[PDB]
């Protein structure tokens, strides 16, 4: 029984690989020789935020491009006003171990979680005038790796269970659960159309899931080691990924294959975070050697480097308007560039 | 007109800042420990006599200690272990040998010792289930470790009075195996603190306190460039 099924799976995989090669007209580099390079990018630190006591592990820009959430392993969830570098809120968490945080698009709720296996969501706009726990979601049997807000009522989550789930905030129950990963699901990213979301896991594979049907639509296996970060190209037809193998890869859903791979011999470190600028021409990634490299999304050349940190860059993000780039690092400092 | 909102935000910033400063003293006044070990180990009894993550809080000589035990997690540990890169020490608990579970414990200790993170974090090693070790030795280890035949008792050994020499030889052979992993790999950035303990042992808290003070003292020496 098992042997026949495995043989069938191998045959299906061989067909998929054959189809993938049949669509390999040319590399993204080859078609992009006609496009001028970005040149040197010299982003410099504009603001420095202090107050976190331990290493930071996640940040998320709000829809207004001003409010920043920052979850640290010290058990605090501080909200920053990037314009005036003055803290707006500081929520004390029930568990000091936090791995992810997010800001609701409406700006009313903030979610977070970690090793506790419980996703905690706090209502900033409260009648009492103080932060409070709107609801706690439980059911994951592993550490909550990433969580993002679809809207004011739905939140999607990923954990170390090798599965993802969609939570309806009102009932506090899993509307649907996504399964098929073999390793820990580390990072998540919602598509711009809020219709699909792509997941990276600790198995050198990335899966594209659809929110409504609750099924995976595409699998990408171009990486070598565990995937740490994942982000969607602004137009929604492509997504970038990062792994410990020291390579950043750009995948296209329509093509279903790795369009481009970013790598340099001098880099032996893994990628911690990844995000795209508003135009998508720049791919910003964080690396273990206390710096972030800006990669030409088309020419695959290092435009510049952000080397203002003294420790690992754990989280990275850009505003919806693309005015500035915020990066969090384990030295408890948030740096805003340009 | 715009000064009213600046004043309100400034007041909020000061209110938040005061709370953060008050919490900073508490956070810096607490020593965080990660209790790691296999299921068969005596860690459950250790916490008893002293959500996916369990917490045990205790004080020795009026100093706060915070010990974290991760129970509700999958076998893979290479990711969530990364969060413990700032703990004062790792309380590693090992059983005595059932199959050769000691080799698995040694491999786990090797991975903890050699990871890029936790490389600066010292490990406090507890060789638990000592009574069972004495019972089995008095009543086979060479089968799981052929090197035991050529091994001899250390010249600096300080066994308890009335102990069987074979028990002491088995004691230090396991300790030396772990110490070889600690010494043959890594550098002087961190050290291993071996201790022999059992379920009924009130000295465990004192041993942890002594190890933590030594680790913090060494850290201060490094900050001052004396080490």
């Amino acid at each position: 029984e098992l042997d026949q099924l495995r043989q069938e799976a191998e045959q299906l995989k061989n067909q998929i690989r054959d189809a993938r090669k049949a669509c390999a007209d040319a590399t993204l580099s080859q078609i992009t020789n006609n496009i001028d390079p970005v040149g040197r990018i010299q982003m410099r630190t504009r603001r420095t935020l202090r107050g976190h006591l331990a290493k930071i592990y996640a940040m998320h820009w709000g829809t207004d491009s001003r409010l920043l959430v920052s979850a640290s392993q010290d058990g605090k969830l501080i909200i920053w006003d990037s314009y005036t570098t003055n803290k707006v809120h500081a929520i004390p968490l029930r568990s000091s171990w936090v791995m992810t945080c997010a800001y609701a698009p409406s700006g009313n709720y903030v979610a977070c979680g970690g090793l506790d296996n419980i996703c905690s969501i706090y209502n900033l706009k409260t009648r009492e005038g103080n932060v409070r726990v709107s609801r706690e979601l439980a059911g994951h049997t592993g550490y909550l790796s990433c969580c993002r807000f679809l809207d004011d009522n739905q939140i999607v989550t990923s954990s170390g269970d090798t599965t993802c789930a969609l939570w309806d905030i009102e009932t506090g129950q899993q509307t649907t659960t996504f399964t098929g990963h073999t390793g820990d699901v580390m990072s998540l990213s919602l598509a711009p159309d809020t219709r699909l979301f792509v997941s990276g896991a600790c198995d050198a594979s990335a899966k594209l899931w659809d929110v409504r049907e609750g099924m995976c639509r595409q699998t990408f296996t171009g990486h070598e080691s565990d995937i740490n970060a994942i982000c969607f190209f602004p137009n929604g037809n492509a997504f970038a990924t990062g792994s410990d193998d020291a390579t950043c890869r750009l995948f296209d859903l329509r093509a279903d294959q790795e369009l481009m791979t970013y790598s340099h011999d001098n880099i032996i470190c893994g990628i911690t975070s990844v995000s795209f600028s508003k135009s998508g021409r720049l791919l910003l990634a964080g690396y273990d050697d206390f710096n972030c490299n800006v990669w030409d999304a088309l020419k695959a050349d290092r435009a510049g480097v952000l080397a203002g940190h003294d420790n690992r860059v754990s989280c990275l993000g850009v505003t919806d308007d693309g005015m500035a780039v915020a990066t969090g690092s384990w030295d408890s400092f948030l740096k805003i560039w340009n | 007109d715009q000064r009213n909102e600046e004043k309100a935000q400034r007041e909020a910033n000061k209110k938040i800042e005061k709370q953060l400063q008050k919490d900073k003293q508490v956070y810096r006044a607490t020593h965080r420990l990660l209790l790691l070990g296999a299921g068969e180990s005596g860690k459950s009894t250790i916490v008893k006599q002293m959500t996916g993550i369990f917490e045990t809080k205790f004080q020795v000589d009026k100093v706060n200690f915070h010990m974290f035990d991760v129970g509700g997690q999958r076998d893979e540990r290479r990711k969530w272990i990364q969060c413990f890169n700032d703990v004062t020490a790792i309380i590693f608990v090992v059983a005595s040998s059932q199959t050769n579970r000691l080799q698995e414990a040694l491999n786990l200790f090797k991975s903890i010792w050699n990871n890029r993170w936790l490389r600066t974090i010292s490990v406090i090693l507890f060789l638990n289930k000592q009574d069972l070790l004495a019972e089995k030795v008095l009543a086979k280890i060479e089968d799981y470790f052929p090197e035991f035949a050529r091994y001899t008792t250390p010249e600096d050994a300080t066994p308890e009075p009335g102990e069987d020499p074979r028990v002491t030889r088995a004691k230090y052979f396991i300790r030396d195996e772990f110490l070889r992993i600690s010494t043959a790999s890594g550098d002087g950035r961190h050290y291993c603190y071996p201790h022999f303990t059992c379920a009924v042992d009130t000295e465990n808290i004192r041993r942890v306190f002594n190890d933590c003070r030594d680790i913090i003292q060494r850290m201060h020496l490094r900050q001052y460039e004396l080490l």
Partner: nanobody
Amino acid sequence: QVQLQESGGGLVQPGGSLRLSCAASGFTFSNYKMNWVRQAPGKGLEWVSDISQSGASISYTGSVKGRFTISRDNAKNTLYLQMNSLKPEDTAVYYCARCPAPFTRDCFDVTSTTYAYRGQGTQVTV
């Protein structure tokens, strides 16, 4: 796609000899450390032996010292394990496991269940 497949196995007379090898694909073999894991019936996964990138460092278990020999061929992208003096306790399914990350010595989760970088394995009987 990253894949590992083993070769060899089958019944072996007590005190006999056998050879197992694992062929790699989808990753740079030279930049990763490799290990062998066996799972005896009714028992959990057991680490067998390991070899570094350059092959200058090697280790085995107490029950395996002197009996088994591990080697690697970076050019052929294959893993090696020479077996002799087999015994009944050696019967198990042998898996070709790969370290999670390159350029690092730690190999945390090779022995864990439902691992992502190990092959289907091959049966060995004595």
